[PDB]
Design a protein around this nucleic acid. Structure first.
Ligand SMILES: [Mg+2]
Ligand SMILES: [Zn+2]
Ligand SMILES: [Zn+2]
Lengths: 304, 69, 44, 115, 98, 64
RNA sequence: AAUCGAGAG
């Protein structure tokens, strides 16, 4: 029989690393049906905040307005998604945006020629003033209660160095961007992960002994820290499977064609998660788990 | 024309690395693979986005209808 | 000032029933300037 | 996609006859609703979003004592890229009888496009 | 509106029904189907998406008896909730451990 | 009532050049929500001599 | 409306 208790006995997690952007960990004794659910929720269903509505007031630059709005929608914003609610689309445009669900960013930048530039200068930063527009130039314009709620943490891009646009003297950009909550299954700009995926733990079943110089070349067919030579007997053994990238270079030699079988542990998933910047990868994974549970609970409580 | 904000395949923000890539190519005498690795681009999907960018925006910008030439 | 000479790029105002030419130089091509207006977009 | 159309108000007249049609609005009573596509000189604002039947350029025709508009004829919405005023080479000074209008249409890859 | 019983496919005794779920895809379908196939009372279980361009999920549950397809669906949903709870708790334990 | 074409309607499809009557058949219309192309099953490609590399084909709506 | 030129299957 299968039971939640029998799953709780055998399931375990091995966090290999954890940063503010990337978290590498393991899920053991779980089914692909649930690991894939977690991965799909991380990529598509976990909400984040991105620029959606752009209100241009002037754009005399070479980049056209739709392209510039698309770029401004792509830049990730360091906003905690819980700090704002969801936009009610059915409401009219006047009352649709409010201080609890919309974040206003502005970008006003004019390019003027630098009258102190040296002769023979080819650097645009020395020839012109504001010849480059960066995501850091996206000022945050708090309105209403967010002037107090966001005082602890001002909204800035996760990558202020993103080169939004370039300018030349006389040219200018003046725009407002409205940032709301959305999910990545709608538009890829709301996806909060650079990439979240997994891979089964590789298995390297050595069938016959590889004693001798053959161990030197057999170990040469894998990533450096995967096969080792035993201190006692000159034998090859599997040190670390996680270090193996499955490239089957050993299979390309008929010497080992009947000495090793390459397989996988069909329940040992190595989740690698990277964050765009708005949330930590561990919190992304936690939110995906919670989303699956909450959607199941909504189905349970829905009348049939 | 101008560097893309994100990598097309995975979505990693690579729009803040074009100027650094040029700096590491010019000031440091780094080859393209070394510069891409030192920018943090490991997946070839992310490497291609910077390794193959053309940067036509600079050539577009020389035709300025708002300044005397 | 709502027009720009296509060659010398000097801003010039062209009144109605007036000769369509740059005042500074003799260029008969004028470019309409883009003035400040609200233009909504989707960041998609 | 970029498309340039040429509005040549000098189509009806020929060879030194008076200027029957002048760009802009007359002193008539025309709907104020089409002031959000056209400037006060009967030309479109740069960057506006045009569709089917939206005004493109207003002209005032004395032969009818009325203000008529030319409209955008395409089922694909576009954006005004640039408006070029063209003056004739003749040393006799005239008004504007030709504005060139440039359209920008967003060609996002759709299901059906060829790669 | 979220969950609908397809009457044309349900059985009179209720032991073989078919459910249409809106705004769902493989993510919930595969997990729910795997969890329901852990009930020793269900005979047949699977999920199908009629058209990929529509966000509609179909779940079929046929039981051997002594329960219904609705009861099997409820049990699978609750088991999925508990599975998520144990995953969350173990992940938090290992986070605090570190 | 000039009602819109529903899912219970039938349509006539044709790809030029019409070399034989199998290149003009009746189809039951299934209305999709997304695109602006006509979607065809693969088994009809043998009859229509059609491939999905730029081919377009007509869709006639009988009225009585 | 023709004529010419460019295309698609
Ligand atoms: Mg064909
Ligand atoms: Zn990438
Ligand atoms: Zn001039």
């Amino acid at each position: 029989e299968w039971n939640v208790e029998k799953f709780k006995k055998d399931f375990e997690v091995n966090i290999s690393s954890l940063d503010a952007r990337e978290a590498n960990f393991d899920l053991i004794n779980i089914d692909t049906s649930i690991a894939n659910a977690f991965r799909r929720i991380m990529i598509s269903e976990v909400p984040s905040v991105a620029a959606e509505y752009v209100y241009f007031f002037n754009n005399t630059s070479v980049i056209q307005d739709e392209v510039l709005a698309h770029r401004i929608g792509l830049v990730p914003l360091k906003v905690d998604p819980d700090m704002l609610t969801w936009v009610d689309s059915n409401l009219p445009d006047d009352e649709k945006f409010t201080d609890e669900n919309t974040i206003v960013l502005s970008l006003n930048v004019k390019c003027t020629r630098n009258p102190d530039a040296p002769k023979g200068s080819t650097d645009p930063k020395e020839l012109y003033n504001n010849a480059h527009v960066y995501a850091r130039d996206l000022k945050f314009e708090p309105q209403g209660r967010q002037s107090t709620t966001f005082a602890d943490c001002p909204v800035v891009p996760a990558d202020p160095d993103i080169l939004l646009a370039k300018l030349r003297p006389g040219q200018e950009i003046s725009l407002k961007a409205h940032c709301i909550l959305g999910i990545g299954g709608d538009h890829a700009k709301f996806s909060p992960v650079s990439t979240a995926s997994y891979r089964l733990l590789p298995q390297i079943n050595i069938l016959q002994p590889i004693k001798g110089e053959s161990a030197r070349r057999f170990q040469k067919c894998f990533p450096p820290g995967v096969i080792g030579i035993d201190e006692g007997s000159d034998e090859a053994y599997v040190k670390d499977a996680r270090k193996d990238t499955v490239s089957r270079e050993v299979l390309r030699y008929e010497e080992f064609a009947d000495k090793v079988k390459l397989g996988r542990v069909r329940n040992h998933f190595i989740f690698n998660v990277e964050s765009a910047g708005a949330m930590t990868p561990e919190e992304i994974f936690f939110k995906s788990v919670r989303i699956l549970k909450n959607k199941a609970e909504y189905l349970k409580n829905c009348p049939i | 024309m101008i560097v893309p904000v994100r990598c097309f395949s995975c979505g990693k923000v690579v729009g803040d690395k074009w100027e650094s890539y040029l700096n590491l190519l010019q000031e440091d005498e780094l080859d393209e693979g070394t510069a891409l690795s030192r920018l943090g681009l490991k997946r070839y999907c992310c490497r291609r986005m910077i390794l193959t960018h053309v940067d036509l925006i600079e050539k577009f910008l020389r035709y300025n209808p708002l300044e005397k030439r | 000032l709502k027009y720009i000479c296509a060659e010398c790029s000097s801003k010039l105002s062209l009144s109605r029933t007036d000769a369509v030419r740059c005042k500074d130089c003799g260029h008969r091509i004028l470019l309409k300037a883009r003035t400040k207006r609200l233009v909504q977009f989707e960041a998609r | 996609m970029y498309k340039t159309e040429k509005v040549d108000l000098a189509l009806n007249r020929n060879r030194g006859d008076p200027i029957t049609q002048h760009f802009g609005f007359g002193n008539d009573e025309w709907p104020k609703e089409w002031l959000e596509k056209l400037d006060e000189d009967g030309l479109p604002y740069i960057g506006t979003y045009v569709e089917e039947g939206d005004p493109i350029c207003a002209y005032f025709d004395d032969t009818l004592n009325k203000t008529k508009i030319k409209t955008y004829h395409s089922s694909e919405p576009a954006y005004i890229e640039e408006v070029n005023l063209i003056g004739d080479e003749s040393n006799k000074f005239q008004e504007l009888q030709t504005v060139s209008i440039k359209y920008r249409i967003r060609r996002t890859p759709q299901i059906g496009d060829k790669f | 509106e979220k969950i609908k019983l397809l009457t044309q496919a349900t059985s009179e005794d209720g032991t073989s029904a078919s459910f249409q779920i809106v705004e769902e895809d493989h993510t919930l379908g595969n997990a729910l189907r795997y969890v329901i196939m852990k009930n020793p009372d269900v005979e047949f279980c699977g999920y199908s998406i009629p058209h990929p361009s529509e966000n509609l999920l179909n779940i079929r549950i046929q039981t051997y008896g002594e329960t219904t397809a609705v009861d099997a669906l409820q049990k699978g949903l609750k088991d999925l909730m508990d599975l998520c709870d144990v995953v969350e708790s173990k992940f938090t334990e290992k986070i605090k451990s570190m | 009532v000039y009602r819109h074409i529903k899912n219970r309607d039938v349509v006539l499809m044709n790809r030029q050049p019409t070399l034989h009557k199998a290149s003009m058949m009746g189809h039951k219309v299934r209305v999709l929500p997304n695109e602006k192309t006509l979607r065809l099953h693969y088994a009809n490609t043998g009859a229509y001599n059609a491939d999905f590399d730029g081919d377009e084909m007509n869709m006639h709506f009988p009225q009585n």
